[PDB]
Design a protein around this ligand. Structure first.
Ligand code: NA
Ligand code: NA
Ligand code: NA
Lengths: 314, 256, 210, 235, 235, 224, 243
């Protein structure tokens, strides 16, 4: 009786592996249909403001997050810069971060389609979910006036304009499936931990420089913070069903384990807020027919997942 | 040269590991191959050197200078290496670049004070290396060329700084030398040939300055086929060998 | 950059003896993996290695294995690219001495070392970081099922990194970059003690874990 | 003395020979290597484990013995059984890609999802155009490639073999490695009862899975139609 | 049936279920659902009967796909050990032309065709798993079948529909309006290639121009006029 | 209410080509295939897709990469790929005019890209499983109304934006599947399903119109 | 502004309108590095040209069954100018244009068809630069290719001519190249036929022909020089090799 390990079976016949597992009410990732992977978070451990008592001088990380789901790890770090500005709920008044996603797989070289699309979609979804107002990125410049004559002190208000620019570096270790959701959630927690450094100043122009210790809260709209979910729609093939000693379709949550990623072509992805509103929805009917029922169950599961991810910490 | 057969490698290794070692051209373990050097041929540069080895390895070094604030530029000496047939991205090129930058670090590679003009300004030294040809690790080749170039380097004379229009002062400094050694069995070899480097158990990069064995010191695989471990007494042998046979390289290079 | 979101160009960046934990096989999409965390007084480090291989190589037939080593800056861009590639070359030499390359013709082994965390509260740190790199790479290679003639170990003292095999009888690696001038023998002894401890810890980790 | 049973890299198992009576000659098998260590200013020739796992000394035909180390308590080699995917077909040969070597997937990451949302080959995306040959062995989903020549399909009747009746694109074929070949391809064979098509789909990968009915024939359960392959014997 | 009807991919197939129907281009039999479904946009074409009717969809295409018994015009782009590498269309997968595939051909007597030569051949093999094969002889008897080299002519790129119409439809006036002006040799290749040679270069040029202009225009009756204006030898 | 302009077979050196225009959004697409793929693109049992999207202004970025990704998600199940094993289909879209504020939105461009790509695939003669139609839909800030084919102005004040690409069979009367639904902004379930019903109707309208446009210039090419 | 051309008819360097800079060449200067080689000095321009081949193609791509592959690599060192360039020039579009220009120049001169399934790599190092560098590159390539024994139809002589107001100035240096438009010419042998014609800045049409007239002539002189070296180097190394 010839036999293949689950790994190499997932390599050889992903569809058959998926169907066979689903015939037993389980998945090749050893979770049942609507069972998410648990998540664990280490928040603000890499930031320079990690320790208020002993602030790291060399560090330039404004925000930090370390997420772990299943066996996949995501490390997100928020750095910053300043741009000189020139010259409602509408989208014009909102901002976004500029993320660089680095999914650690065997290769070395320029960005893959995965990394590029995940980065861009992170940016765009941050913009459209309206989590970060442009107003919150405005810098209130203090001025460095000289102590008597002999050194220098800075005065902040309790004359050009300026704006904060946030950058995100997101590295993904031990990828086993689609990692956009993990990146989004990690970036959310990371954004919640960001502290904006205070800034001061002295055809010719003087540079603006950030204060070493002082920092103000990055005030984001907590109302609009959503969390990410993904789902697969699988059509059961009668021949590949196990004996377990007329067509059916099942909904699957939190895809993983290659067999699922290779076989499933009908996918749903949601950014859902704890309040009840939805920030993003993506339907791709590459395989099985996407019915309204599936959409509704997906929205339900996305919202409970959102409540879960927003409540489980603090 | 490179890509020798297993038979050739066995023969060469057996000759090089026997006591005493028999080198393919009959050289003594401490003997260098004939090279010749030319200087002062690039007028546009402050210094210049060209070194040609007997096996064909040829290198060119240019010495240029520019005024900089120490405070904004703490590094007053920068080495840029360009090897022909190798991209600037290449691992070996950046390795050699880093190494050379460390041998020549203004910190203690050379005497920084000799560069100072004013308490706010000085000459930054740009050392540009162009390896035209190389059949072995070119680190010693480059090092020697740089030595010659620096020992024949002239800079504009100070009188914001203004400079003499026609008169220039010779840059006085003791440039360091980097030596490369081949570890074959229990034998240490100076100036390893390509075929010698193809069978060498390992290698030793040993820097040298003012008559002292200075840093950086590296162990370096001269190949990937026969890289083996070595005993510490061999390292001691290499160091002793350098500090014994270095002042004659220094007096040979510094006699003009 | 056309392949990255770097944001506005007008913007400018914001300016302003030791305990060991060793684990293996926690990264699922590679052959080998190792987590090494080190804690000394007022100094804490932590790094991860991943061995992808034996993989296929582009180009002509090769008679033996071809090892690549890639150092990746973690968090802070702490080190120069040239120095990273130099250290990479050093490690390549070491594990060219250690790995049984004859077993892997026409094949490439790619090793990645992520320098996630390196915060030392004390107020050229590459040297002190190299032995942990070597530890992690040996662990990950053993974890990947990549054959090793020995367990490559190392130690650091006075800017002198020395990497040993065979119970410290012979040397596979020697790195000396300034870091003051002291005689060679005691650096050898200290680095050898570090090596032996690291070796014991690594075999222990390879016996509780694999 | 008795050979130690647990093994780690750098650990010495036994000397080159041993007498207990006759003089066992020790052959360094998989996971071991014959290294000449130096002790007390003197030479010792020993079999050394190069892997982590249980050592085994098994006996095959004064009399020498095979010493190896097995993981637990890879790379295609000559004689190794590999599971492959038929990529190309021609009158002379069958091009395949190695998916697994001895119940071990190669590579470990196939690169799924790397290239986007459609159905894309390992190097059919943006990443393949910007791959650094200088700094890496191969790209993300790159596999060891293999060739099953028409002659090496069967044991007999090798002269007039139609590869189109043996394999189809997309088929999963169980093969054995004849030779290392060149840099591009291993040379494989299916000339054994346990070697050949282990998985196949009707209509050249488009239809549903077929099952092996006879040595040279599979059939589809839903259609009933039969297709001609060279089936590896199950069980 | 006899009434041809416009059809889109996904539309319901309108032929008689009880009547057996052999399926041509445009009509796809789904490997999983076993449903008969149209996959090309165009005109649905049902032949009368016989023994079974043919249902096919005539659709506008520019890209040729090799099918057996097709007369094609290729260009030699490579020479191998026992075959020619031939191109039926730029950027398309090449086709094989055996050295044995010629009249009076043996291992001692080889064909004299070089890289860059035009060959007029018949698609003898077009398997979906293999490289297509063409021939320059009657496969049955082994003698000349009107195939072979095309020398010193001019080639014309044309859409598939135009070429098929040119080879099969005798009520097509282009050849007739061309014959009205000059004597010419023509080779028609279903791969969308038309070879033309006249005794005088001027006349061949005229043929080229008028054939291409006729190809760009949908109206058939215009041809004569075009030919006139083209053979009036304007610049 | 919704009227579009569309042309077919406008490019000479490709197998198929199309020009799609909705409001101010203008996109030209080309298709070459099935042709020989390079080894890294090749698939054993099915057609491989090389998809390219070029912006109206500037040079291709990650934005256009996402556009290519979604376009691929739409076109992959559309094409009968198993008819062309080990072959390539080259699909290139050149956005001539965005018809929307590029920095904030790209849904118009995406929809027109899908429509144009479909039309060009039809013109090329490539086997398609079924028909397809895509529309952009917006929900406005104050009115909270659902606008199909929204203008750039309407987009500026939109509360949410949506791309709806549907797959049609049987004369364009039956919805086989939803190829793509890309929803971004703030919205709820009720709004979603209202948007889906209206969207489906308008997309059916678009399918009909597209059928007519296709037959209008394909029919004269063919013989009775 | 300064007397680029004095009423006396002299230039800043002291040359007249129709005089070449100092032109010296050396052949077989790197016998252990390349099959052919040339070191060349034109004014202050100092260039090393290395010809490797014909040889086996590195890849089993880039192999042509009908002709040889010709590659040209131009290395403009960072120390070629007075002010060191902090940036490499290797991937600049200017350098790529120069490379492709030289390649397409010598594709029609070198008999590539008699070296099929081979690759001819040309490796150039510009050690020092002082204007008119294109013609210098051309001359270096010609010399090195001839030294390699690689067959070609004729010499190709490169020269530059600036246009100051009404008068053209032959073989312009760096100072003349600035504040003036220049034409670069690649002339085949002693013929009037041009391999290369490069104009990168605005020039009055009605005065272009005249600029060519002297240019060609100058190029001819350059040919006579290169020739004069080769023969000598030939005459020397064919007599000493005897007995
Ligand atoms: Na290898
Ligand atoms: Na000439
Ligand atoms: Na003259």
């Amino acid at each position: 009786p010839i036999t293949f390990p689950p790994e190499v079976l997932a390599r050889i016949s992903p569809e058959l592996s998926l169907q066979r597992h689903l015939s037993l009410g389980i998945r090749p990732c050893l979770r049942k249909y609507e069972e998410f992977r648990d998540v664990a978070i280490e928040n603000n451990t890499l930031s320079r403001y990690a320790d208020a008592g002993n602030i790291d001088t060399k560090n330039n990380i404004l925000g930090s997050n370390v997420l772990k789901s299943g066996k996949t790890i995501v490390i997100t770090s928020i750095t910053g810069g300043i741009i000189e500005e020139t010259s409602e709920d509408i989208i014009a008044n909102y901002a976004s971060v500029y993320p660089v996603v680095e999914v650690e797989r065997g290769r070395v070289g320029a960005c893959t389609d995965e990394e590029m699309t995940i980065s861009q979609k992170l940016h765009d979804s941050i913009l459209h979910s309206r989590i970060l107002p442009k107003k919150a990125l405005k810098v209130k410049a203090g001025v460095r006036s000289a102590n008597e004559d002999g050194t220098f002190s800075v005065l902040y208000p309790d004359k050009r304009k300026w704006s904060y620019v946030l950058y995100a570096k997101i590295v993904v270790l031990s990828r086993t499936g689609p990692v956009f959701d993990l990146c989004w959630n990690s970036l959310m927690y990371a954004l919640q931990s960001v502290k904006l450094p205070r800034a001061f100043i002295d055809r010719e122009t003087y540079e603006i420089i950030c204060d070493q210790t002082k920092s103000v809260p990055l005030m984001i709209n907590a109302k609009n913070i959503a969390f990410a979910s993904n789902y697969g729609i699988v059509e059961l093939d009668p021949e590949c069903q196990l004996q377990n000693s007329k067509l059916n379709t099942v909904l699957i949550a939190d895809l993983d384990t290659e067999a699922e990623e290779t076989s499933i072509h009908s996918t749903i992805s949601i950014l859902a807020a704890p309040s009840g509103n939805y920030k993003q929805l993506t339907l791709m009917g590459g395989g099985a027919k996407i019915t309204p029922e599936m959409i509704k169950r997906s929205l339900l599961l996305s919202r409970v997942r959102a409540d879960d991810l927003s409540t489980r910490f603090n | 040269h490179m890509s020798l057969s297993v038979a050739e490698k066995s023969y060469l290794y057996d000759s090089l590991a026997s006591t005493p070692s028999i080198r393919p051209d009959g050289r003594l373990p401490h003997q260098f191959r004939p090279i010749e050097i030319f200087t002062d041929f690039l007028p546009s540069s402050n210094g210049s050197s060209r070194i040609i080895a007997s096996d064909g390895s040829e290198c060119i070094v240019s010495i240029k200078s520019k005024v900089v604030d120490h405070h904004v530029e703490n590094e007053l000496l920068q080495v840029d290496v360009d090897i022909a047939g190798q991209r600037d991205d290449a691992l070996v090129v950046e390795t050699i670049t880093s190494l050379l930058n460390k041998v020549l670090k203004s910190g203690s590679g050379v005497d920084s004070s000799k560069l100072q003009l004013t308490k706010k300004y000085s000459f930054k030294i740009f050392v540009d290396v162009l390896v035209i040809s190389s059949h072995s690790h070119p680190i010693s080749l480059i090092s020697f060329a740089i030595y010659s170039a620096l020992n024949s380097t002239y800079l504009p004379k100070l009188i914001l700084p203004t400079f003499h229009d026609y008169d220039m002062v010779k840059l006085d400094i003791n440039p360091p030398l980097v030596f490369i050694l081949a570890v074959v069995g229990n034998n240490m070899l100076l100036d390893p040939a390509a075929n010698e480097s193809e069978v060498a158990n390992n290698g030793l990069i040993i820097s040298w300055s003012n008559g002292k064995i200075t840093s950086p010191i590296r162990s370096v695989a001269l190949n990937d086929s026969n890289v083996k471990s070595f005993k510490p007494h061999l390292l001691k042998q290499g160091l002793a060998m350098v500090e014994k046979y270095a002042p004659d390289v220094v007096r040979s290079l510094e006699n003009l | 950059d056309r392949r990255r979101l770097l944001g506005p160009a007008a913007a400018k960046p914001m300016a302003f003896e030791q305990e060991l934990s060793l684990h293996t096989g926690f990264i699922e999409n590679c052959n080998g993996s190792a987590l090494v965390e080190a804690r000394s007084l007022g100094h804490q480090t932590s790094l991860i290695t991943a061995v992808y291989g034996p993989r296929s190589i582009r180009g002509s037939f090769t008679s033996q294995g071809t090892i690549s080593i890639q150092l990746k800056n973690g968090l802070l861009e702490k080190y120069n690219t040239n120095e990273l590639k130099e250290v990479s070359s050093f490690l390549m030499g070491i594990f060219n001495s250690v790995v049984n390359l004859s077993r892997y013709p026409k094949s490439g082994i790619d090793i990645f070392v992520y320098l996630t965390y390196d915060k030392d509260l004390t107020n050229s740190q590459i040297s002190s970081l190299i032995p942990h790199c070597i530890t992690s790479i040996t662990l990950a290679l053993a974890d990947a099922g990549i054959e090793l003639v020995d367990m490559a170990g190392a130690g650091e003292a006075n800017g002198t990194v020395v990497s040993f095999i065979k119970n410290g009888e012979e040397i596979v690696g020697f790195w000396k970059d300034d870091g003051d001038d002291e005689d060679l023998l005691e650096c050898l002894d200290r680095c050898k003690e570090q090596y032996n401890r690291y070796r014991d810890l690594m075999i222990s980790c390879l016996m509780n874990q694999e | 003395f008795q050979f130690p049973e647990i093994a780690y890299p750098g650990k010495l198992i036994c000397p080159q020979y041993g007498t207990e009576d006759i003089i066992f000659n020790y052959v360094p098998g998989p996971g071991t290597k014959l290294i000449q260590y130096e002790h007390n200013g003197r030479t010792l020739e020993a079999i050394t484990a190069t892997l982590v796992g249980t050592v085994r000394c098994e006996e095959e035909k004064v009399k020498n013995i095979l010493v190896s180390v097995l993981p637990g308590t890879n790379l295609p080699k000559e004689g190794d059984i590999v599971l492959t995917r038929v990529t190309r077909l021609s009158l002379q040969r069958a091009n395949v890609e190695i998916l697994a070597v001895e119940d071990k997937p190669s590579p470990i990451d196939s690169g799924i999802g790397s290239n986007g949302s459609g159905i894309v080959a390992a190097g059919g995306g943006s990443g393949a155009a910007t791959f650094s040959v200088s700094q890496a062995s191969s790209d993300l989903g790159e596999t060891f490639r293999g060739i099953i020549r028409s002659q090496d399909v069967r044991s007999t009747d090798r002269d007039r073999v139609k590869v189109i009746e043996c394999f189809k694109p997309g088929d999963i074929v169980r093969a054995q490695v004849l030779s290392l070949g060149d840099g591009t391809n291993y040379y494989l064979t299916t000339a054994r009862n346990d070697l050949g098509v282990v998985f196949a789909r009707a209509a050249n990968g488009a239809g549903g899975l077929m099952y092996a009915t006879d040595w040279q024939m599979m059939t589809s359960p839903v259609t009933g139609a039969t297709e001609k392959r060279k089936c590896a014997k199950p069980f | 049936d006899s009434m041809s009807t416009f059809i889109f991919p996904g539309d319901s197939f309108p032929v008689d279920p009880t009547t057996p129907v052999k399926l041509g281009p445009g009509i796809y039999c789904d490997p999983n659902t076993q449903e008969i479904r149209p996959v090309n946009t165009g005109v649905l074409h049902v032949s009368a009967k016989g023994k079974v009717q043919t249902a096919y969809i005539d659709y506008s295409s520019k890209r040729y796909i090799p099918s057996v018994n097709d007369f094609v015009i290729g260009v030699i782009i490579g020479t191998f050990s026992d075959s020619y590498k031939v191109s039926l269309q730029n950027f398309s997968s090449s086709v094989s032309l055996s050295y044995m595939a010629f009249p009076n051909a043996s291992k001692k007597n080889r064909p004299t065709l070089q890289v860059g030569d035009l060959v007029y051949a018949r698609v003898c093999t077009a398997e979906k798993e293999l490289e297509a094969e063409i021939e320059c002889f009657d496969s049955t008897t082994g003698r000349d079948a009107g195939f072979g080299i095309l020398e010193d002519g001019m080639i014309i790129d044309v859409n598939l529909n135009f070429a098929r119409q040119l080879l099969f439809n005798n009520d097509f006036p282009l050849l007739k309006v061309l014959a009205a002006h000059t004597k010419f040799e023509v080779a028609i290749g279903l791969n969308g290639k038309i070879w033309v040679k006249c005794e005088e270069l001027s006349n061949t040029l005229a043929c080229y121009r008028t054939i291409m202009e006729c190809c760009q225009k949908n109206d058939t009756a215009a041809f004569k006029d075009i030919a006139k204006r083209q053979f009036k030898e304007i610049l | 209410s919704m009227s579009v302009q569309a042309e077919i077979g406008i490019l000479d050196h490709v197998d198929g080509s199309s020009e799609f225009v909705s409001q101010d959004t203008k996109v030209i697409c080309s298709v070459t295939g099935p042709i020989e793929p390079k080894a890294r693109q090749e698939l054993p049992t099915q057609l491989a897709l090389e998809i390219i999207v070029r912006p109206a202004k500037g040079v291709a970025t990650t934005r256009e990469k996402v556009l290519e990704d979604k376009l691929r998600a739409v076109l992959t199940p559309l094409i009968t790929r198993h008819c062309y094993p080990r072959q390539l289909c080259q699909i290139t879209c050149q956005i001539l005019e965005s018809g929307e504020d590029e920095a904030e939105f790209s849904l118009r461009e995406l929809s027109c890209c899908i429509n144009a790509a479909f039309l060009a695939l039809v013109d090329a003669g490539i086997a398609l499983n079924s028909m397809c139609a895509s529309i952009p839909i917006a929900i406005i800030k104050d009115t909270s109304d659902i606008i199909v084919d929204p203008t750039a102005e309407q987009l500026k004040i939109s509360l949410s934006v949506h791309t709806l690409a549907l797959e049609f069979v049987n004369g364009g009367k039956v919805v086989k599947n939803v190829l793509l639904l890309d929803s971004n902004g703030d919205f709820n379930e009720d709004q979603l399903f209202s948007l889906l019903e209206l969207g489906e109707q308008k997309c059916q309208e678009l399918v009909t119109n597209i059928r007519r446009i296709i037959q209008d210039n394909i029919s004269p090419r063919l013989v009775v | 502004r300064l007397e680029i051309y004095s009423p006396e008819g002299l230039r800043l360097d002291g040359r007249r309108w129709n005089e070449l800079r100092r032109f010296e060449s050396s052949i077989n200067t790197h016998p252990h590095a390349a099959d052919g080689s040339s070191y060349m000095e034109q004014g202050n321009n100092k260039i090393i040209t290395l010809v490797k081949g014909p040889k086996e193609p590195r890849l089993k791509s880039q192999m042509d069954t009908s002709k040889a592959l010709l590659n040209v690599s131009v290395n403009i060192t960072k120390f070629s100018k007075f002010e060191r360039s902090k940036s490499s020039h290797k991937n600049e579009r200017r350098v790529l244009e120069i490379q492709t220009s030289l390649v397409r120049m010598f594709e029609k001169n070198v008999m590539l068809n008699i070296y099929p399934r081979t690759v001819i790599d040309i490796e150039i190092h510009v050690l020092e630069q002082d204007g008119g560098i294109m013609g210098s590159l051309i001359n270096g390539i010609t010399l090195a290719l001839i030294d390699a024994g690689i067959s070609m139809f004729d010499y190709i002589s490169g020269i530059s001519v600036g246009l100051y107001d009404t008068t053209p100035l032959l073989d312009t240096n760096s100072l003349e190249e600035n504040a003036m438009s220049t034409v670069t010419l690649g002339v085949v042998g002693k013929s009037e036929k041009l391999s290369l014609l490069l104009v990168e800045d605005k020039i009055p049409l009605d005065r272009l022909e005249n600029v060519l007239a002297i240019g060609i002539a100058g190029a001819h002189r350059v040919r006579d020089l290169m020739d004069e070296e080769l023969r000598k180097h030939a005459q020397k190394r064919v007599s000493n090799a005897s007995a």
